[PDB]
Amino acid sequence: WGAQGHRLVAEVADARLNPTARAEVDRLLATEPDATLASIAPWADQLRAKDPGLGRRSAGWHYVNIAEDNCHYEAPKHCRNGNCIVEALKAQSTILGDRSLTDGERLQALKFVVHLVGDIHQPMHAGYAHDKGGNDFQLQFGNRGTNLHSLWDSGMLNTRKLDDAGYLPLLQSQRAPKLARQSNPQRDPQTWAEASCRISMQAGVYPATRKIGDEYTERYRPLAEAQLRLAGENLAQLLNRVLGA
Ligand SMILES: [Zn+2]
Numbered sequence: 370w371g372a373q374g375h376r377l378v379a380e381v382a383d384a385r386l387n388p389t390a391r392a393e394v395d396r397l398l399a400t401e402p403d404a405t406l407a408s409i410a411p412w413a414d415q416l417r418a419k420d421p422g423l424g425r426r427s428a429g430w431h432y433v434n435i436a437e438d439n440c441h442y443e444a445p446k447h448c449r450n451g452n453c454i455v456e457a458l459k460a461q462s463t464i465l466g467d468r469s470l471t472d473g474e475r476l477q478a479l480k481f482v483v484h485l486v487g488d489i490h491q492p493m494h495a496g497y498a499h500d501k502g503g504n505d506f507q508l509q510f511g512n513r514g515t516n517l518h519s520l521w522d523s524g525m526l527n528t529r530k531l532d533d534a535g536y537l538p539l540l541q542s543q544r545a546p547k548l549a550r551q552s553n554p555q556r557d558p559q560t561w562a563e564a565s566c567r568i569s570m571q572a573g574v575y576p577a578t579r580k581i582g583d584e585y586t587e588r589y590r591p592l593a594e595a596q597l598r599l600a601g602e603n604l605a606q607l608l609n610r611v612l613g614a
């Protein structure tokens with residue numbers, strides 16, 4: 370997602386934390402002046418942008434391209450050296466839960482968990498390796514040149530013309546998604562990546578033309594918005610497992 374998608378995932382999650390995970394999240398956030406679950410949600414993208422070390426080391430952690438293998442994940446093939454979102458989210462979930470670590474270490478792991486639960490629910494972050502998750506599929510959206518990756522990260526969300534305070538209750542108005550009956554932080558990432566991959570491969574998500582507009586938005590923006598709600602609810606369920614147990 371773009372920044373707004375990441376914030377909205379965190380805002381949906383923040384309201385669903387159990388009292389224990391509430392207190393532990395607040396304790397870790399207070400070690401960074403003015404940090405909220407929403408405000409840190411885009412951080413992993415700004416790091417990858419600007420940081421010559423962790424930014425370069427974590428750039429592959431935002432995605433996993435499994436569409437050519439029909440959305441069947443294999444860690445050795447699709448996540449060499451743990452360099453994809455499935456293994457990165459598993460490892461950062463373990464680090465975040467490790468109460469023997471410093472507040473600094475666990476807050477950084479929280480920033481990755483908040484961001485990556487967002488990104489693992491963005492269909493184009495689990496798509497084709499060969500076109501870089503739709504980045505190479507250039508297309509005209511209304512009168513504006515963009516690409517299929519950007520369309521799903523922010524282009525369709527931007528058409529609502531809502532700030533976070535307007536967009537949040539819209540997402541909360543949806544019927545509740547069915548989650549796993551129990552969080553398994555080591556197994557659920559593969560499930561989520563595969564599900565996001567299957568959406569990238571659904572009929573029409575890759576359009577038959579390179580000029581699209583209102584028809585595409587009206588069909589697929591509701592799916593993007595369902596994915597933000599699902600991501601937010603899965604993030605709360607994970608944080609309640611890792612920090613609220
Ligand atoms: Zn993102």
Ligand SMILES: [Zn+2]
Nearest residue numbers: 370494518522
């Ligand atoms: Zn993206």
Ligand SMILES: [Zn+2]
Nearest residue numbers: 413414431488
């Ligand atoms: Zn990202």
